[PDB]
């Protein structure tokens, strides 16, 4: 794909091939905590990951995806703003070249060192590619990363990056438990938005957790050793793969707390 994160193919250029980039419900956005409103109508959030079945980790040239078996209801997200059930298909991260940047969402303009996206699709639509064509097709659980204490549940991921350094490399990644990536609190903000990479489809109910997880400097440093390029090509570090905040336009961010 032509698009990327650089001066010549980055976020400011995406609109020429994906005009929806200048659309009415684009992501990420800045979350202004003073204007987000508590919504008592929100039902309790349900993150049911006990039977999660991970498969593989892939360096796709832009980030790395950990993929799950979504053939059945094994890891699902329910409740909150959501109706019906949403199946986990993959997670990935966005991160920075420095600790003061890397997240996509911001909180009162605050940028975190990274941001985890747990991507889920609405089972009523039967497969992922159909769901992304629906305004309520996806639900993405967003979790901020700050640098501090190591996150033990992340270390298996960090441990395998060595084996997928370059674009197109994949590795077995079975028996990984995403519950180890969750903070204590499931207090969130929610708004309707989009994929944050091309094709930028406006199909996501965003659920962004208030509580960040802490990871260590050594953990984040290993993220930054990945490569955008393919094997045997000149090295370009995989850093700053985040889209900046987009205009909120006619949307309201709701708080669960
Ligand atoms: S989403 C990132 C897409 N790939 C690149 O922008 C790139 C730049 C330089 C070397 C390899 C790949
Ligand atoms: Zn993402």
From Swiss-Prot:
Annotated effect of mutating residue 197 to S: Enhanced p-nitrophenyl acetate esterase activity, but normal CO(2) hydrase activity
Entries under Gene3D superfamilies matching the protein: Alpha carbonic anhydrase
Consequence when changing residue 197 to H: Higher affinity for bicarbonate. Enhanced proton transfer capacity
Domain annotation Alpha-carbonic anhydrase: ranges: 1-257
Cofactor binding summary note: Zinc. Can also use cobalt(II) with lower efficiency, but not copper(II), nickel(II) and manganese(II).
Outcome of substituting residue 195 to E/H/R: Strongly reduced CO(2) hydrase activity
Catalytic residue positions: 62
Annotated InterPro entries: CA_dom (IPR001148), CA_dom_sf (IPR036398), Carbonic_anhydrase_a-class (IPR023561), Carbonic_anhydrase_a-class_CS (IPR018338)
SMART domains: Carb_anhydrase
Pfam families attached to this UniProt entry: Carb_anhydrase
Localization: Cytoplasm; Cell membrane
Keyword check for Heme: no
Binding site for substrate: 196-197
Keyword Membrane listed: yes
Additional remarks: Target of drugs used in treatments against glaucoma disorder and breast cancer.
Known function: Catalyzes the reversible hydration of carbon dioxide. Can also hydrate cyanamide to urea. Stimulates the chloride-bicarbonate exchange activity of SLC26A6. Essential for bone resorption and osteoclast differentiation. Involved in the regulation of fluid secretion into the anterior chamber of the eye. Contributes to intracellular pH regulation in the duodenal upper villous epithelium during proton-coupled peptide absorption.
Protein name as catalogued: Carbonic anhydrase 2
């Amino acid at each position: 794909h032509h698009w990327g994160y650089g001066k010549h193919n980055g976020p400011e250029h995406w609109h020429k091939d994906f005009p929806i980039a200048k659309g009415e419900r684009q992501s990420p956005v800045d979350i202004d905590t003073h204007t987000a409103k508590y919504d008592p109508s929100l039902k309790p959030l349900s993150v049911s990951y006990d039977q999660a079945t991970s498969l593989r980790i892939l360096n796709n040239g832009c980030a790395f995806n950990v993929e799950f078996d979504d053939s059945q209801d094994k890891a699902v997200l329910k409740g909150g703003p959501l109706d019906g059930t949403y199946r986990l298909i993959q997670f990935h991260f966005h991160w920075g070249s420095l600790d003061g940047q890397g997240s996509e969402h911001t909180v009162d303009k605050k940028k975190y060192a990274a941001e985890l996206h747990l991507v889920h699709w609405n089972t009523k639509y039967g497969d992922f590619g159909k769901a992304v064509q629906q305004p309520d097709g996806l639900a993405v659980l967003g979790i901020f990363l700050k640098v501090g204490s190591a996150k033990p549940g992340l270390q298996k991921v960090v441990d395998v990056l060595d084996s997928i350094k370059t674009k197109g490399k994949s590795a077995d990644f079975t028996n990984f438990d995403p519950r180890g990536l969750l903070p204590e609190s499931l207090d969130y903000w929610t708004y309707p938005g989009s994929l944050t990479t091309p094709p930028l489809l406006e199909c996501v109910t965003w659920i962004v957790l208030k509580e960040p997880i802490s990871v260590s400097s050594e953990q984040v440093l290993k993220f930054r050793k990945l490569n955008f390029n393919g094997e045997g090509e000149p090295e370009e570090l995989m850093v700053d793969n985040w889209r900046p905040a987009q205009p909120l336009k006619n949307r309201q961010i709701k708080a669960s707390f």
